[PDB]
Amino acid sequence: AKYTREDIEKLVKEENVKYIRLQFTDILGTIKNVEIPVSQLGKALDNKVMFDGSSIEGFVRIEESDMYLYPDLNTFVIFPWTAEKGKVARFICDIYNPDGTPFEGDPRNNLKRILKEMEDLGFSDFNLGPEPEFFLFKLDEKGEPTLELNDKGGYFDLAPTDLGENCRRDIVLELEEMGFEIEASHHEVAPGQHEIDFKYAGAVRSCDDIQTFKLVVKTIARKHGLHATFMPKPLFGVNGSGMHCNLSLFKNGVNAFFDENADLQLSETAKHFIAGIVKHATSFTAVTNPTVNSYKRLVPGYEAPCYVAWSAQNRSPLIRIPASRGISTRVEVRSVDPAANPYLALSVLLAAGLDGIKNKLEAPAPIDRNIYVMSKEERMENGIVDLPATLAEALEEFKSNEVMVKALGEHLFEHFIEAKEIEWDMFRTQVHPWEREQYMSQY
Amino acid sequence: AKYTREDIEKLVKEENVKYIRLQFTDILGTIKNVEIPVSQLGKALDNKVMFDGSSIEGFVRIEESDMYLYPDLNTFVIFPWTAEKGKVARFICDIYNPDGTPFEGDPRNNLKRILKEMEDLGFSDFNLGPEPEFFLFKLDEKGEPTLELNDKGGYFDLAPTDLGENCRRDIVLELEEMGFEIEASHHEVAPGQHEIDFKYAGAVRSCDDIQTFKLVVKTIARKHGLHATFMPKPLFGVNGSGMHCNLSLFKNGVNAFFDENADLQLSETAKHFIAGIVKHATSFTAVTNPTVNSYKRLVPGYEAPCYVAWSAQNRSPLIRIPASRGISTRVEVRSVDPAANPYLALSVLLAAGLDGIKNKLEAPAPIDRNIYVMSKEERMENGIVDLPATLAEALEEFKSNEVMVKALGEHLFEHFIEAKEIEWDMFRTQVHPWEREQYMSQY
């Protein structure tokens, strides 16, 4: 453990905090919280604060339901932005039923359940290394985002340079001062696109860091007069934004994916994991790519994955295996986008990987000959299948997969399906300006 | 050596650096980097930082590739522009394959390979003294370059004078404060054109200094509300910008080009070097002049070379031999423009010189008759040939030369050829405003 109750009380005592945010994550991934004064810290640490648990369901909630707000002590963070009369601290909390049972509708509790299932298979840790990337858009006079990018930079370019600006540098330094473990940063391919990589950590800690990273990036970009968005594809004809997930499975404290005496230095467990990810790839796409805009990124020609295959060196593979081996042996899933709920995406990825391991599925042959060369029919005879092209198609694929349904449980499944179906129905009935530009004068 | 590891940690400790740029150079010559927090300095100095090595290829990159980022300790420089919370330091790094083999696609590693080949011939050092010329353009209200020059100065004029301005003086002083060895500076022939000359140093150090010089000049000009460009020919009817390269070869610590008992006080090695440069001059022009605009400078009447010849005193010779002798005996190649990649240009120049030395080629007679007077056909019967007129012609000449292909390896050759062919194809299909001014009303 990193913090105890006495440490928390002492820290708030000298730091003079007055507001405490008991934050949590709903179905859609947006950060929610209930706020208490510092005088209620004792009640909060006793797992006694109640709130409306239906707020997790998002806009499809129908009935108020009382839930508890068990906080996690290790997630205690003091925000650097003082709230005038007193500071603000946060806790990331689990959701519990009034009878003490963990709430089945909490994505974090679902991820913990999947991790317990993983531990039941003999493994100890499931490490995630994320690569979130985002766009920076200039704000106008009224303080709302525009379509102008902050810089015309390139891949790994020294574009922002010195002499002020360099919002990426400020974000990295500020995150370092908050206890984050930043690995490296660089300018992304598209103009105004940036990437910051964290050091790998545990799954729950990694997801919490992803949420905190989104919050901090948005706040700091707002400080610099900029808009930071994790939208998968804000602009057409320009590189999208992914959240490539480097997954590593550990057994007894050692990497279970590494085997020095096997081909590609990959263990049989790693091959089973790859097979499991490949088998369910078309099914969890709805979770890893939960928005309508997510599937405008999944188009050929922008290095985003479009077909279910794994490789060590290829143009936009679904699964990529980095050259580094040993303790750092990992499998990278590149379909995930930053708009996905980290807990749900990690849950479905881990469930697919464990399904591959449990049934000892055989991984297909790696592809190293540029699948983009041949036609769709010219590659369908192989094991290369297409990812869903729309959110509705991914929803249809996800519903039919029995294994992926239990990856998040009945409550989460029904509410996610309802919300996504409503979202798709709203989109498909709209009349976009493109249609008027194409047909208003032609017809 | 100049810096050791412990010196690096100590220096960053007192100077309180928080951001470290691990900078490198791609095929097109633009400076790239991956940035790490100071907490990752130990991992960086262990040659363990990974990155996408395909970023070296530029815009023709196909697939992601993992490479290491071996930094050079002697290149440690602390940037004078403090970045708010902490300073910024830089390392110039080599690119290595994951198996520890140096990456064949790294221009700096290619230059090191060519230098190793030179050492295999018995020579010890290859010194370079550059004369980079640049233009200064005023910025507008929106902070973008205009076509107005900063002064109406002349050759060696005392035009900027005292009383503020004098961006060249500030650049020279600032570079001196950063550890550069500036030899002399003067106003160039064209208005708003300036030249700063460094002391001669080793080839790798000279190229690193050229890159740092470009970065620093651009930054300082931006500080003074000016735009600094190393474009070979930004304006028509005005002198272009060159990067005359003074090359000197050393054997056992003494100059190998000097021989007091021979004519012109030149050794046989110097004559072989000149012959080698003359033989391949039309072939490496694509590397030393890699842009479309580079060949608008290579036009008669502006002191830029246009024919393959060497002389001690002539109007715009390709190779010029300065009057100074002894230790300072050198051969100056004047066709190089500042837009060229320093590592690739030095590699091809050294390869041509060594080819002349290895085969003991006979240098042609020096030209002292103002070949501009005689016609092209009136000089073709001699040993004087014309440089390529366009980038496409230079690419065609470069492809056919076998020696110049090995000068930079197959990887660099294919990627450079692809990028330059795309660049030429983009230019040749454009319809320029000159064409509309010439034909829209006439036809």
Partner: peptide
């Protein structure tokens, strides 16, 4: 096609 983001600079 097959390469649009990389050559987007042109």
């Amino acid at each position: 096609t097959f390469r649009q983001g990389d050559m987007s600079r042109f």
